[PDB]
Design a protein around this ligand. Sequence first.
Ligand SMILES: [Zn+2]
Ligand SMILES: [Zn+2]
Ligand SMILES: [Zn+2]
Lengths: 319, 310
Amino acid sequence: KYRLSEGPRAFTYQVDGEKKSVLLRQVIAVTDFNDVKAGTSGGWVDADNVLSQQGDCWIYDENAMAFAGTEITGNARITQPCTLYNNVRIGDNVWIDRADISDGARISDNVTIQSSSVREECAIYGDARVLNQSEILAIQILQIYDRATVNHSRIVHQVQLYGNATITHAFIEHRAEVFDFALIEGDKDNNVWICDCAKVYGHARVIAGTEEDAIPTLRYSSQVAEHALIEGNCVLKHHVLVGGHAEVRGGPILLDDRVLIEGHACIQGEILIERQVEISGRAAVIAFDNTIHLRGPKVINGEDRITRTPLVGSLLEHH
Amino acid sequence: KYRLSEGPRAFTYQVDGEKKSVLLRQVIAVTDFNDVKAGTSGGWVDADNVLSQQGDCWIYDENAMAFAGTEITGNARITQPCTLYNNVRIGDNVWIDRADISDGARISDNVTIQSSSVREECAIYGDARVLNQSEILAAQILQIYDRATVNHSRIVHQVQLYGNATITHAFIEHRAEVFDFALIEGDKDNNVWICDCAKVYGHARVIAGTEEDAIPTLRYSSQVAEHALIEGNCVLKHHVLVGGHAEVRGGPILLDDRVLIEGHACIQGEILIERQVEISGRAAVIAFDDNTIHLRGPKVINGEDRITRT
Ligand SMILES: [Zn+2]
Ligand SMILES: [Zn+2]
Ligand SMILES: [Zn+2]
């Protein structure tokens, strides 16, 4: 499929703020294949094993770099200025565009990485799409697959994203997972933070608000699934489970220490819910532009309408 | 169950900037039932047939009003100051909380109407929830049913909302329909606009943006389906459908005259797409902040097409 240019050339690239260079040879097609005509020059490599002679895989940009143990095979297309190095693997029908990939990252199947960067041991396969300035820093390994779509987001550590999850402007850390039809939607003024072992799946939605720091924050192992929806300045900490067709908005809101919210429950405004509280049915907890504090053990259901802190039971007596 | 107070009082209510007055007698429990102890006074009516003697239905607030043909039956609960007039029908296990219902509205099953207003011939049934300052203003009638949720939205004319749709901060009008797992999400700076005969269904998502006038606007017969996501300043017009797993953002964007965007398509930036254009596959059409993109067909964009300019 191709031959390497004769004269090697040095190319610079920076790693962790340091400037580094490598000697590479330019790939030159010696025959027609796919959308590549013989005689055309592509990217640069540091060994003939970097780019497979078989299949349709190819490096199109003359500023593209692939070296240090990286291996491109199959029909993988690498377009625009890219930098792949340190035992990276790209095969099948993968598409890499103006993105950087390094440190043993393995991109397979029909994946797309565009205007983004991926670093360290992780597995991005299936029909996953990582786009628009996303940053994937791996460090169980981090996986993004199925039809998950990541947009201008930062995925780190050992996060798992799959199913049809649609993430945008989010920061998912540690061992957080987002799958099924989950929608994580931050905006330019507020990201969405999902940390630790939190999980968002089913048809759940987590939507940042427009107010200053109205950052939806899912911590520890709290979850949001089924048809639940969380928006605005909301923080979920220890053992919180939001499901059913519940809706949480307003802020600031804090859910912590064994809180279960499902059914038709609507929770809106500055509300603090904690300590064994279960809300379902058609209950409404609304704090009109006001504050509400709910503490259990306590079951709120049926048509309970709460517009002020209830001065009874667990609110006035703990232990 | 209850008796009317012998002394009728005069109450006032606002009707289109007008000041109205009506004579109502107050309801008073004469026996115990559900959560109402005998002897407690409830709301006010203008007839004994307004509140059924059967079932648990009851008007709790002493400031609530229900007159002029309104009929409350079954176990319907009317709580807080409410105004129900002009042939309204409330029954079954419906819960109306601090809201005004008028002009022949029929609310059934397990619906919840809270801090909102409903007016005219329309049907709200199933397990629908109309909450937080929503305004329902109604050959077919406006219908809100199944598990549909409405938050601080304006639903007008003959709109249909059902399935597990979730509507917030939106203006849905005329004959638009939203269902399945559709998500219509506006914010306090921008609402979402759905008009004419537009339809949003499947797992579609239409999210308003944060910048001034970033109003997603669906007109004529445009549709958003399957897993498509539309955000920000985007306008969909004649014969337009966004589906698959397409994602349209940035702005301002305009789609018109037979345009189909699906597959994995990502449309981002100030882009004008029109006249028999199809975009799918893993195609990307991105107009980098300063730049603009104008696509006019017939034309097909797919595979790994990457358009950054016209
Ligand atoms: Zn908001
Ligand atoms: Zn309209
Ligand atoms: Zn935005």
